[PDB]
CSV table of N, CA, C and O in Angstrom, one decimal:
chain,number,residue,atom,x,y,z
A,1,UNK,N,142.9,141.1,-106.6
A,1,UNK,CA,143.7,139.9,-106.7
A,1,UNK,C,144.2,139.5,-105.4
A,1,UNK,O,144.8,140.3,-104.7
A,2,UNK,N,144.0,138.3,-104.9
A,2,UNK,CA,144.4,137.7,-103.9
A,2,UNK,C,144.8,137.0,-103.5
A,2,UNK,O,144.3,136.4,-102.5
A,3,UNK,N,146.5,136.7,-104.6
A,3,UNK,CA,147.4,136.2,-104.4
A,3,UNK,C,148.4,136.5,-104.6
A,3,UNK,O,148.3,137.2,-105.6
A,4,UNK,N,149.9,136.4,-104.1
A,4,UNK,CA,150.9,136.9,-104.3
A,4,UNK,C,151.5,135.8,-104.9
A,4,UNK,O,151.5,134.6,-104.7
A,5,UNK,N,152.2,137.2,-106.2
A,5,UNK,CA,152.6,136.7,-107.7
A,5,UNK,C,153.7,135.4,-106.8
A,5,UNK,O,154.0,135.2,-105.6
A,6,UNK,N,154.0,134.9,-107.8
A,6,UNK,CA,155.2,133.5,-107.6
A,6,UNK,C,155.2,132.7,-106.6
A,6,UNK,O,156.2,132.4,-106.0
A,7,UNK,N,153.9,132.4,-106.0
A,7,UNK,CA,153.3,131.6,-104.4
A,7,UNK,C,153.3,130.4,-105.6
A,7,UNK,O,153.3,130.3,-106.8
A,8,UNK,N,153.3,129.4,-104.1
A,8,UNK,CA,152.1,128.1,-104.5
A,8,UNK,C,151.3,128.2,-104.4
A,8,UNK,O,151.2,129.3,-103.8
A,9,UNK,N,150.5,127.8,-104.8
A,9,UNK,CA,148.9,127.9,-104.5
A,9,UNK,C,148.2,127.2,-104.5
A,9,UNK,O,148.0,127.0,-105.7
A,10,UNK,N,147.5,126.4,-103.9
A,10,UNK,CA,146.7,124.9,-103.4
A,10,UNK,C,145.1,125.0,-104.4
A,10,UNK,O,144.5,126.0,-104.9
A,11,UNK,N,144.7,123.7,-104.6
A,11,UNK,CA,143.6,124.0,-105.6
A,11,UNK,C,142.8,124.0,-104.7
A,11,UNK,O,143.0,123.4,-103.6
A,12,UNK,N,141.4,124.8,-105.2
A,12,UNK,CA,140.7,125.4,-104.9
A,12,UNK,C,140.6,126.7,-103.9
A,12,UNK,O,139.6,126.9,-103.2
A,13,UNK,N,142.1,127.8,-104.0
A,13,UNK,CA,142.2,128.9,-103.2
A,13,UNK,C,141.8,129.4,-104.4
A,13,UNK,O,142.1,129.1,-105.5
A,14,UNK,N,140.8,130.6,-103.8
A,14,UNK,CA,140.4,131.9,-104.3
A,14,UNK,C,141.7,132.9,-104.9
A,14,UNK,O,142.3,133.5,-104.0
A,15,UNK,N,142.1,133.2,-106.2
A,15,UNK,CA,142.6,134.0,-106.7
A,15,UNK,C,142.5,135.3,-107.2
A,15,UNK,O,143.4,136.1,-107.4
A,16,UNK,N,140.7,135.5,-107.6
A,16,UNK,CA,140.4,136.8,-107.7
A,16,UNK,C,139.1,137.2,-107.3
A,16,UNK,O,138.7,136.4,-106.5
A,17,UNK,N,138.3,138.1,-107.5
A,17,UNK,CA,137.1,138.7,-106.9
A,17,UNK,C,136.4,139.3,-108.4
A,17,UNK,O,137.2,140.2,-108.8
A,18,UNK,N,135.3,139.1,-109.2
A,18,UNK,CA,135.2,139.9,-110.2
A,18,UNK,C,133.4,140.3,-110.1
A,18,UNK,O,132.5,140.1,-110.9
A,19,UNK,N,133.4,140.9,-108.8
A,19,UNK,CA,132.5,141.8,-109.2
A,19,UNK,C,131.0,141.4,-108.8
A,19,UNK,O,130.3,142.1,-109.5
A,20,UNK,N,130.5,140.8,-108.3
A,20,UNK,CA,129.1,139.8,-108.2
A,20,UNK,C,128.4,140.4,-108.5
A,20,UNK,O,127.9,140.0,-109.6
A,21,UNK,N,127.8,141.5,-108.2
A,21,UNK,CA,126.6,142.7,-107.9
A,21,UNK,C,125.4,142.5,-109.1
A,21,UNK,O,124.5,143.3,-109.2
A,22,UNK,N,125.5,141.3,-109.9
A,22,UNK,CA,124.5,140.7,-110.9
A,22,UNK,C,123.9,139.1,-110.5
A,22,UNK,O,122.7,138.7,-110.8
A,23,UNK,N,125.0,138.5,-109.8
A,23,UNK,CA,125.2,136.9,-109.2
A,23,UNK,C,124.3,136.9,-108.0
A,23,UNK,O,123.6,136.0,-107.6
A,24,UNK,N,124.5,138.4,-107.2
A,24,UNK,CA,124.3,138.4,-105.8
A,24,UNK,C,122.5,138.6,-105.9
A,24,UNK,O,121.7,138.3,-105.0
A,25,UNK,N,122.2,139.2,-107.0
A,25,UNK,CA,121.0,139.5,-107.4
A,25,UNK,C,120.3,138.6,-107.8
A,25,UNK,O,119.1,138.5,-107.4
A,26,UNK,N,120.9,137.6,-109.0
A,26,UNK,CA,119.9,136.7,-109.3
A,26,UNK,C,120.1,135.4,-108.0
A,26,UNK,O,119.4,134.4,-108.2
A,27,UNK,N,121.0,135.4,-106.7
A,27,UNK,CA,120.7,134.3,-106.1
A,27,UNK,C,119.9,135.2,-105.2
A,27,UNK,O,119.5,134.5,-104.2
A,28,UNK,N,119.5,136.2,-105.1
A,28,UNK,CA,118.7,136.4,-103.8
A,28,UNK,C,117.5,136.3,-104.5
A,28,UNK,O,116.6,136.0,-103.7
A,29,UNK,N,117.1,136.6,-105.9
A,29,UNK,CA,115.3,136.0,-106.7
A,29,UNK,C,115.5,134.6,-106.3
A,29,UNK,O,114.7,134.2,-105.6
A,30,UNK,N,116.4,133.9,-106.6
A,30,UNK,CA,116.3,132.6,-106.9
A,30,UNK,C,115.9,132.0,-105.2
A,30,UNK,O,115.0,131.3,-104.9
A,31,UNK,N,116.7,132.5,-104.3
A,31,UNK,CA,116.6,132.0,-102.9
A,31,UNK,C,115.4,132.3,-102.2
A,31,UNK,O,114.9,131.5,-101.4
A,32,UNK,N,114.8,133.6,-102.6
A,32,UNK,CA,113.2,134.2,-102.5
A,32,UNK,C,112.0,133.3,-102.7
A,32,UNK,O,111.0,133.1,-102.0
A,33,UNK,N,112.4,132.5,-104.1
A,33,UNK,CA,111.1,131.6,-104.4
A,33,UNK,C,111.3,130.1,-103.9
A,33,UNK,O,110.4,129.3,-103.8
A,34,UNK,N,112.7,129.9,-103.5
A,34,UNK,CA,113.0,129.0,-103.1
A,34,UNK,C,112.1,128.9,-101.5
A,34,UNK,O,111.2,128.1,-101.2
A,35,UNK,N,112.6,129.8,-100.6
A,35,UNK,CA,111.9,130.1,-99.2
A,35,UNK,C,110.2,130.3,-99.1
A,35,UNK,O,109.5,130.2,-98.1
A,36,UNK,N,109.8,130.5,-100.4
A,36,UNK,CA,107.9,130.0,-100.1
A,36,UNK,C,108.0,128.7,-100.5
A,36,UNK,O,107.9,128.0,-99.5
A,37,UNK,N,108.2,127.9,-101.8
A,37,UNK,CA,108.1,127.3,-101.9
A,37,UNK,C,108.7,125.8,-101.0
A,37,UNK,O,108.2,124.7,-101.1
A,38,UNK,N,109.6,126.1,-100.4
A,38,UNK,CA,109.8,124.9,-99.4
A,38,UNK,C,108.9,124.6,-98.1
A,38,UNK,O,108.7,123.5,-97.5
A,39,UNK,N,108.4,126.1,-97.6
A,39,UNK,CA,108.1,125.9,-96.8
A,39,UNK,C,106.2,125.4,-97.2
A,39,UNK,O,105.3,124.9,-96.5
A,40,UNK,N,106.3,125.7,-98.3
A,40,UNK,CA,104.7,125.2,-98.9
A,40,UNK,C,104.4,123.8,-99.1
A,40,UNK,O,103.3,123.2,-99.1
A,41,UNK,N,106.0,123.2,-99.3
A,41,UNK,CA,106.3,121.5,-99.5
A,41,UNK,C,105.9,121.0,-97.9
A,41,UNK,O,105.3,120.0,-97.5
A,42,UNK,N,106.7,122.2,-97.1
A,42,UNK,CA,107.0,121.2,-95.7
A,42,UNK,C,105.5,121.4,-94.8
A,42,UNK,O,105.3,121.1,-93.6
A,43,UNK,N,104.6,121.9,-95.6
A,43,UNK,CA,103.5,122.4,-94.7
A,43,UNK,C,102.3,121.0,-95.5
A,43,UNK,O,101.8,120.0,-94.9
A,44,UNK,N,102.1,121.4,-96.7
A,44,UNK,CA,101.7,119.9,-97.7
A,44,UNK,C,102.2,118.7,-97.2
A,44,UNK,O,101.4,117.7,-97.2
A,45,UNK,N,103.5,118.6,-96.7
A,45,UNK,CA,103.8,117.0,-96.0
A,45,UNK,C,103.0,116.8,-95.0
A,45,UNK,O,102.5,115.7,-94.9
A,46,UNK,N,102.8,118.0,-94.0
A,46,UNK,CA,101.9,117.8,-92.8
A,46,UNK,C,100.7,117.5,-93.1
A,46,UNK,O,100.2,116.6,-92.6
A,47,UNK,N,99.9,118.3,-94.2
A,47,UNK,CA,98.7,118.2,-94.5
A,47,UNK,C,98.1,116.7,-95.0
A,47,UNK,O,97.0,116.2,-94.6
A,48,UNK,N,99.1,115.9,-95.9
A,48,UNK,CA,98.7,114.7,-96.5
A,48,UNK,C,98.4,113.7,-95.7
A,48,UNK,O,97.4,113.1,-96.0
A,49,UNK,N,99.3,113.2,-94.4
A,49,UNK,CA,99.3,112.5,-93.5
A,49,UNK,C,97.9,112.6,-93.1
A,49,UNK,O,97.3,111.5,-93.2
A,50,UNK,N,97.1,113.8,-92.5
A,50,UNK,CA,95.9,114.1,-92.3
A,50,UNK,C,94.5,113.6,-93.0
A,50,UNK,O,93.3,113.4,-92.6
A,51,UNK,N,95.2,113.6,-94.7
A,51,UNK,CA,94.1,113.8,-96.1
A,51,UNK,C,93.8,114.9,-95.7
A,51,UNK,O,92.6,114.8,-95.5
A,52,UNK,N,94.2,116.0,-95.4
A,52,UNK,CA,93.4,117.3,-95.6
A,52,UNK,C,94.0,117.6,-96.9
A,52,UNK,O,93.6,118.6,-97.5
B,1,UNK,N,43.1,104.5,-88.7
B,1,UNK,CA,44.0,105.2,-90.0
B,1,UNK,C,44.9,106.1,-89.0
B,1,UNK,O,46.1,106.1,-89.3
B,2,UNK,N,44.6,106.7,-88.2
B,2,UNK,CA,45.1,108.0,-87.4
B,2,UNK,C,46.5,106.9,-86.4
B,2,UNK,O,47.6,107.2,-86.2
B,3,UNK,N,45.9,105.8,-86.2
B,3,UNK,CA,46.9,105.6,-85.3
B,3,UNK,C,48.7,104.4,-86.5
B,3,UNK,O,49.9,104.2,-86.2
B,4,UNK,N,47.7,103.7,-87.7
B,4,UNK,CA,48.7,103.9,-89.0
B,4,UNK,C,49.5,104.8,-89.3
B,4,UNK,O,50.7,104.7,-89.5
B,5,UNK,N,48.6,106.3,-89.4
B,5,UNK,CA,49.4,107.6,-89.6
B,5,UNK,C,50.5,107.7,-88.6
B,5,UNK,O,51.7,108.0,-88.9
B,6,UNK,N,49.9,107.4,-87.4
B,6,UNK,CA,51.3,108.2,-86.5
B,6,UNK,C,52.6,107.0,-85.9
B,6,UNK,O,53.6,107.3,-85.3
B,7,UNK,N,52.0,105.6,-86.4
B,7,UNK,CA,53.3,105.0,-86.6
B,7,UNK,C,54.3,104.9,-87.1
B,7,UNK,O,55.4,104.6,-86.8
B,8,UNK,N,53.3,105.3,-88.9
B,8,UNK,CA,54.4,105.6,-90.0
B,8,UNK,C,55.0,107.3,-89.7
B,8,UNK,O,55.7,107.7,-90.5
B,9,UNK,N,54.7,108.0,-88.8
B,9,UNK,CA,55.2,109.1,-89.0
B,9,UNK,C,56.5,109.0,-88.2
B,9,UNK,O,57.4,109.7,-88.5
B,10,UNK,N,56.6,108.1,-87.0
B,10,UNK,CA,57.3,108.0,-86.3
B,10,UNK,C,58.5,107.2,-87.0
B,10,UNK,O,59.7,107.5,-87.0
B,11,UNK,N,57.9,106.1,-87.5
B,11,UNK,CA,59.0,104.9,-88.0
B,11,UNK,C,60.1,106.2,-89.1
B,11,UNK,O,61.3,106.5,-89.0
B,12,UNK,N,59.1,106.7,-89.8
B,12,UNK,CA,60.3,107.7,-90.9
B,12,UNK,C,61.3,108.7,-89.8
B,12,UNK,O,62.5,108.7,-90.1
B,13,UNK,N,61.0,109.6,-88.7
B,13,UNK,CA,61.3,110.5,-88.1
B,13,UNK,C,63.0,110.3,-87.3
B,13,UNK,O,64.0,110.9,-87.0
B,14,UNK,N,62.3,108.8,-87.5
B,14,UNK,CA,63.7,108.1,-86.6
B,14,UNK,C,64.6,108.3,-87.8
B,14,UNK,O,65.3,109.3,-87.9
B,15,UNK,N,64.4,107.5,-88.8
B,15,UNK,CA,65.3,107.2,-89.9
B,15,UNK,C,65.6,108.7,-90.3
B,15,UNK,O,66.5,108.7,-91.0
B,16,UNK,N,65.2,109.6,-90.2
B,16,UNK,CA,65.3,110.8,-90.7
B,16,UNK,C,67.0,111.3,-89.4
B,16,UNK,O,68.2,111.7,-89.6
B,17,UNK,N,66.1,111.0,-88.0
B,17,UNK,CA,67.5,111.2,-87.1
B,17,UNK,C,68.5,110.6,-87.4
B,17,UNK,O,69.6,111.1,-87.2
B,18,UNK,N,68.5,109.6,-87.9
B,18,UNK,CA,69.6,108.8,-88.2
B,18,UNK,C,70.6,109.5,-89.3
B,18,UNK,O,71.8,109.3,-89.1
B,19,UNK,N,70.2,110.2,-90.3
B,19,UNK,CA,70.5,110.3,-91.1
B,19,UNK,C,71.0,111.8,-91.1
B,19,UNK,O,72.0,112.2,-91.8
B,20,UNK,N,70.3,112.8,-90.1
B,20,UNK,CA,71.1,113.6,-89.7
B,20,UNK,C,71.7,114.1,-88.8
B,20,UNK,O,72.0,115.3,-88.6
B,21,UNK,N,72.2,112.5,-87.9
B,21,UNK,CA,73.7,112.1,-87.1
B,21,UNK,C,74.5,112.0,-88.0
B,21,UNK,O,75.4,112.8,-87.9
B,22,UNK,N,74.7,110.9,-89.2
B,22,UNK,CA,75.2,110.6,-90.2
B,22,UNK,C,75.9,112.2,-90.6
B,22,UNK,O,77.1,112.6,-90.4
B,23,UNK,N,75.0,112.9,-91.2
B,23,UNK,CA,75.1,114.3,-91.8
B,23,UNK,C,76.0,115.6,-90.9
B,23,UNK,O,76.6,116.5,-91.4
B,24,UNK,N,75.7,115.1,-89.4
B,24,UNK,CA,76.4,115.9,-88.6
B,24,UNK,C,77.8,115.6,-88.3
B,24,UNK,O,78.5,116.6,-88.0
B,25,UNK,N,78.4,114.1,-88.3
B,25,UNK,CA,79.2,113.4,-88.4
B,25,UNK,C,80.1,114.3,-89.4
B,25,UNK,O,81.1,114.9,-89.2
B,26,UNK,N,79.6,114.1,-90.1
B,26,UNK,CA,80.6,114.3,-92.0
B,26,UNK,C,80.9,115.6,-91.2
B,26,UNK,O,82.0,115.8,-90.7
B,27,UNK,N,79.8,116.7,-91.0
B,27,UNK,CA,80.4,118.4,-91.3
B,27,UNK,C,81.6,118.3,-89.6
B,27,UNK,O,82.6,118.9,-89.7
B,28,UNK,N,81.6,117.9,-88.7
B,28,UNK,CA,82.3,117.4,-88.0
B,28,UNK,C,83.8,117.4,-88.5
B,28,UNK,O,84.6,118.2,-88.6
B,29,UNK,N,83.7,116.0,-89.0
B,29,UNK,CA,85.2,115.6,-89.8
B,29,UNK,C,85.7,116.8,-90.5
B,29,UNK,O,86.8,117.4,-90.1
B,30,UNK,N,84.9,117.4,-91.7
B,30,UNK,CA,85.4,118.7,-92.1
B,30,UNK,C,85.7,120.1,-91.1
B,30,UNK,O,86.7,120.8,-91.3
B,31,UNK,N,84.9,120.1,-90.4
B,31,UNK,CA,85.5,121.3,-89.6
B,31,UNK,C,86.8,120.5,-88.8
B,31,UNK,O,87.6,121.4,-88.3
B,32,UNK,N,87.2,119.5,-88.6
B,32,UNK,CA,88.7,119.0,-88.0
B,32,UNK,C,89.5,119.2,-88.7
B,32,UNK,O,90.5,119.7,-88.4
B,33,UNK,N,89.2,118.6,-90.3
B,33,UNK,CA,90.3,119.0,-91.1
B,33,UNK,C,90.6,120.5,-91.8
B,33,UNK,O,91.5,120.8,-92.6
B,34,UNK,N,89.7,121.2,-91.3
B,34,UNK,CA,89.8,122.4,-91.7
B,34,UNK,C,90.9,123.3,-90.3
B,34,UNK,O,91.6,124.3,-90.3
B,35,UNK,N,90.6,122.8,-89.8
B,35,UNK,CA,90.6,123.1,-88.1
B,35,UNK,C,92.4,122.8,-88.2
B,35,UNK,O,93.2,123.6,-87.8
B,36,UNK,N,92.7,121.6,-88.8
B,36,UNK,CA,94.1,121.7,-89.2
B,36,UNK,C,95.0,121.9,-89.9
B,36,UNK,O,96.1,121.8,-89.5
B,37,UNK,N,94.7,122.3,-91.2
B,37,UNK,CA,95.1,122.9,-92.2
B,37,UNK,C,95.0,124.5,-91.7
B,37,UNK,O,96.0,125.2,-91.9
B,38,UNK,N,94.0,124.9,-91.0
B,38,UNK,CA,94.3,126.5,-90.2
B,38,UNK,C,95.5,126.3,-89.3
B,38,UNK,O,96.5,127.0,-89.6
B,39,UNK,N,95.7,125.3,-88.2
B,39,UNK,CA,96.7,125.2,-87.6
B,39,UNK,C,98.3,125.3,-88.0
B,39,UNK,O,99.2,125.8,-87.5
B,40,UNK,N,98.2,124.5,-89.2
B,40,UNK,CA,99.8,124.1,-90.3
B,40,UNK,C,99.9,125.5,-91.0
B,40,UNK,O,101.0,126.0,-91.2
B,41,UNK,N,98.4,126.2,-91.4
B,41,UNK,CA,98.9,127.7,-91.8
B,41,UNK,C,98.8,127.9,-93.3
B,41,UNK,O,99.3,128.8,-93.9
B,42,UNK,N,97.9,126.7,-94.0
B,42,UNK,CA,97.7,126.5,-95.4
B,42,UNK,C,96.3,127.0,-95.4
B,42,UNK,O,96.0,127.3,-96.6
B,43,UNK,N,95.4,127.1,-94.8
B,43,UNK,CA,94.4,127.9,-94.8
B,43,UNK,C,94.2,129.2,-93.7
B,43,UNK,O,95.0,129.3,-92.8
B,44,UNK,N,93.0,130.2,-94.0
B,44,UNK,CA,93.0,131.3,-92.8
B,44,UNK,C,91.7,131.1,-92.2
B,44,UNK,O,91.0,130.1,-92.5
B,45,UNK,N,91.5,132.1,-91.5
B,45,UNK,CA,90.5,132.2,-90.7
B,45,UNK,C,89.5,132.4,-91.4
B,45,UNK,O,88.5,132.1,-90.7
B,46,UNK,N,89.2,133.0,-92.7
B,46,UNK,CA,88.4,133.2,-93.1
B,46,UNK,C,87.9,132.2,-93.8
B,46,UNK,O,87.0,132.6,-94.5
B,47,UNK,N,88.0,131.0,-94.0
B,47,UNK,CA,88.1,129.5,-94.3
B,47,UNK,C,87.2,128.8,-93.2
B,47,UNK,O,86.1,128.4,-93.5
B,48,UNK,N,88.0,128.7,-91.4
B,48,UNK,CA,87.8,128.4,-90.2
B,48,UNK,C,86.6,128.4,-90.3
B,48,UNK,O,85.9,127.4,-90.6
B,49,UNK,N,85.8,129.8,-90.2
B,49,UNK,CA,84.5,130.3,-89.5
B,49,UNK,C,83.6,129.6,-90.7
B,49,UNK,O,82.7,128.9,-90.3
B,50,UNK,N,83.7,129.8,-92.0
B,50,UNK,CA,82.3,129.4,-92.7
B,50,UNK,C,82.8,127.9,-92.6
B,50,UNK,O,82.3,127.5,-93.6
B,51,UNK,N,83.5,126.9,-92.0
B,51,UNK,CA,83.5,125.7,-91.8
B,51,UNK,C,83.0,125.2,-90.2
B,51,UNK,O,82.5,124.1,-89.8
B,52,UNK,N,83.2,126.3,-89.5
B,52,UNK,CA,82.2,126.7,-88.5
B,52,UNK,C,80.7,126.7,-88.4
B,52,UNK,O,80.1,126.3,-87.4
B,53,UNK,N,80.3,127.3,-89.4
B,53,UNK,CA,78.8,128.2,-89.6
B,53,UNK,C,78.2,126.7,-89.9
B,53,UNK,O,77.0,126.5,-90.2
């Protein structure tokens, strides 16, 4: 918990922490296929200009 | 007849060069664009050389 009880507190401050160790996993699949596939877009951009 | 023969052999021979400048042209163009698609990294070497050959 990472706020002290009876503060103000501004919106959007972080209040608690629950745990990622499932979130942290499915964004690192998700960021994996994301990293071939962009770079397969940005390589295809070069290629079309050519018609190869 | 012999010297018909060897006009018409010539008249064709030419058109025949022509046609495989034409033909040399094309595999040309292909080994360029192969030649860059190796470079960008979407094809390998093993692509390169039989577009080579």
């Amino acid at each position: 918990r990472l706020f002290k009880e009876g503060s103000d507190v501004k919106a959007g401050q972080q209040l608690y922490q629950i745990d990622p160790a499932t979130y942290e996993a499915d964004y690192q699949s998700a960021q994996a296929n994301l990293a071939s596939t962009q770079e397969q877009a940005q390589r295809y951009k070069l290629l079309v200009a050519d018609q190869a | 007849a012999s010297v018909a023969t060897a006009y018409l052999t010539l008249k064709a021979d030419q058109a025949q060069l022509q046609l495989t400048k034409d033909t040399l042209g094309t595999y040309q163009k292909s080994f360029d664009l192969t030649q860059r698609s190796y470079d960008v990294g979407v094809a390998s070497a093993l692509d390169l050389r039989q577009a080579q050959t």
